[PDB]
Amino acid sequence: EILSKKPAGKVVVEEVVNIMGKDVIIGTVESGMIGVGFKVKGPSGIGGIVRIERNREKVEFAIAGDRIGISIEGKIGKVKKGDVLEIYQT
Ligand SMILES: [Cl-]
Ligand SMILES: [Cl-]
């Protein structure tokens, strides 16, 4: 469940791949910011950010303009290239 009203950040999806059951999203933070543990509001589900990578490095958070890879726990539904995902700190 998402307990906040406004997103901490938004991510535009560049590529989506499913690998051994987990959704990995490649994309760029469009605004605000995201951190490990934040929640992803998808089309039909809410996911948790479990890991973020930027330039092949593990990072705890990312901000607008960062291009990143994201691992999500939870089934969030069908995400496609071009989707903009809302990310909530709680
Ligand atoms: Cl592209
Ligand atoms: Cl921005």
UniProtKB/TrEMBL annotation:
<dbReference type="GO" id="GO:0005525">
    <property type="term" value="F:GTP binding"/>
</dbReference>
<protein>
    <recommendedName>
        <fullName>Elongation factor Tu-type domain-containing protein</fullName>
    </recommendedName>
</protein>
<feature type="domain" description="Elongation factor Tu-type">
    <location>
        <begin position="6"/>
        <end position="86"/>
    </location>
</feature>
<dbReference type="GO" id="GO:0006412">
    <property type="term" value="P:translation"/>
</dbReference>
